[model samples]
Target: KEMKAIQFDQFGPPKVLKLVDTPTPEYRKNQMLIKVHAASLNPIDYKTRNGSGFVAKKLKNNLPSGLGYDFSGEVIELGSDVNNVNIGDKVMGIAGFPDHPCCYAEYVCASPDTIIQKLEKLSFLQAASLPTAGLTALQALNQAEVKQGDVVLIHAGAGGVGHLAIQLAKQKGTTVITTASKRNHAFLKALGAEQCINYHEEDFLLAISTPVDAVIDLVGGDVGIQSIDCLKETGCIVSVPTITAGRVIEVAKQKHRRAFGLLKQFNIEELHYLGKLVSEDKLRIEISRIFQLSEAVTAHELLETGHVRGKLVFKVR
Candidate 1:
């Protein structure tokens, strides 16, 4: 079966994405062929799509490559060596780790270990959104060692990972505080944040009554630096933006606090845990909008605005 996918010969803006018909991929000896149902977008998608990310330079000569990471689908076929999962199983996972092609297509071929079974209760779209941002939140929270009654602050609480992290922290019985614009305050509260600060209007540093046990900084730059001050003397700050970690570390040391850089790609196991949480209703994903696969260019344009309240998804048929 031929398949339709979005690809680009050269990178620039969302306008670069072009929908084209391509051959249906066949599974290798250890791979499984999945009938992709849904996929989610991330900042990394736009960055890599536009040829501006760390890995983009490597793929400069490899234009027209697939663009996507997280996806949920049903296994349609498997290689002779594949086991542990059968055809028709519902699965979700991340591909193209160091330099893996993404899931924005009708079918995808990946290793069995790379896919996680989705709970019956979750939709393909929701499951697709979890692999990247969800893993980041889980690993960051785990490394932070968040505990019951501990106060935690999540930057960009309305964002993809931040919104999920807020709920997870609150479920652990921690006081969750997050930053956002005034418009998203109500939504953040609905997601279980104990406090929502309008970053533009409030100086969070001066407004916080008590020091937090840990800080999850999603928005880097000065926001990350300020988050360090919100932590207790020995409290730790976990930052997702690697580029800003060095400067944040220097500031943390000056203030006698510990800082850690969150590595998003290391927690494949957490994807299953997140799946379980979603199944049990302990975690929830907020999908702000959805776009058709062919509208990938429009989706990327919206994501670049950086004002999306939650995740944006691309529906793959």
Candidate 2:
């Protein structure tokens, strides 16, 4: 089948994205063909499109690439050896590592292991938003062992992973504090954040009088280093920045505390748990905007602004 996709030959600006025709990939053993319904965009999408990040190096020979990570679709065709997913089953999953099955196309061939069966209660758009961002929050919360009455500080609280983490913390009855712009305070409050600090106007470290039990740092660099000072004795900081793991560990040792890195790996078990939470209304996803596949460039430009309140999605077939 012929498929339409947003692709780029050379990376530079958002204009690099172009609509092109390509042959739909055939499913090999252990893979299934998916007719994509919806897909979500992430910072990694834009960063990769711009020829930045470690992904660029990996794709050196595969330039003129397809971009996207999270997707929700229906299983249309199954490979002879694939037994886990049934044809016509609605599912969502994280694509290739460092890259996923590109969701910018109408259809894709995905590994059955990474696919999560979607609940009938959830919409394709909602499912599309879950795979990457939701998995990140779920994993981070798990690593931190967030619990009732525990105080947690989430950096960039209004962003994709941060907002979800805030709600997850609340579901556990934890006191949630987050950092965002003044405008996003009300939004984060509605998402269950107990306190929202304006990072531009004040130092978040000094804003809290008491040390927190855990810290989920989405904005690394200085914000990550400052998080160490805000953790309670023996508390843990889970930093997501791929490069800050060692630095966070060093800082934790200096403060007589503990720190760990949060890495998102696609697991069907985690996705099912997240889906159950959404079905129970215990979890919610915030979508900042939806862009057409042709508008992939525009979507990346908006994410580059770094002020989006939630996740941005790309709608395909």
Candidate 3:
């Protein structure tokens, strides 16, 4: 069967994303073919689509590279080696971890272990938002060793990853402080942010007043370097952006602090756990807007703006 997909013939801007009908992927042993329902956009999606970042530059951007990773949908067929799941089961997962999954299509094929059954209570739009951003936040928090009563500072608090990190930190019993514009403070506060530092009006390090136990840096480059100052001695800094962690490592060493560069690891265990969080109502995703799969051009344009309150979803089905 032919499936609709979004692709770019050249890497430059949002308009490059063109919809075309492509063959539905076939599954090998241990794999399954899914009828996709929804997908979501992320900073990496657009950056990679434009071939801008260091990682994106090396990717085969010659033309027709896929644009997304996270997706939620129903299973249509299963390979012989696949077990523990039925054909009609609804699932959510990430694909092509270090690369784009080509998820902005009507169908996708992957190993069953790559996805988990979606929660019955959540819509596919909400389930599609979990894989990349949610796991990135969860893994970073675990790597930073955030625990009860810890004082953690999260950068880009209003972002797709930052918003989830805030709620995850709050659930872990920590004091959450985040950086955003003055406008998002109330929104951040509602998400359990104990404090919101207006990045434009004040310096986050100076505004924080006291040292924090852990610093999650989503803003790389010079901003990431400066973030080290906010850490207490022996405290750790988790760098999520493309900036060299070695740079932050040297800075932290000089101040007697710790540094960890995070990359989201894909596994069935954590993906299932993430679904449970939503099922129990402990964590929630706020979608900024929804766009049709055919409107991928406009969707990429909005994501590039860098000020979306939450997630931007694509109703692909």
| TM-score per model over all chains | 0.94, 0.96, 0.95
On residues 160-263, what C-alpha lDDT tens digit does candidate 2 reach at each position? 88888898889889999999999999999999998999989978887897989999999877788889998888689999876667787788888888898877
Worst 10 residues of 2 by lDDT: 94-103
lDDT of 1 at 164: 90
Weakest 10 consecutive residues of candidate 3 by summed lDDT: 54-63
lDDT of 1: 0.85
Name the regions of candidate 2 deviating beyond 4 angstroms.
99-101
Candidate 2: residue pairs that collide? 95-100, 95-101, 96-99, 96-100, 96-101
Q: After superposition, how far is residue 169 of candidate 2 from its true place, in Å?
A: 0.4
TM-score of 2: 0.96
The models' CA-based lDDT, in order, is: 0.85, 0.86, 0.85
lDDT of 1 by residue, 96-196 (tens): 66585757888888887778788899998999988888888888898899999899999999999899999888888899988999999999999899899
- Go through the candidates in order and give the clash count of each: 2, 5, 0
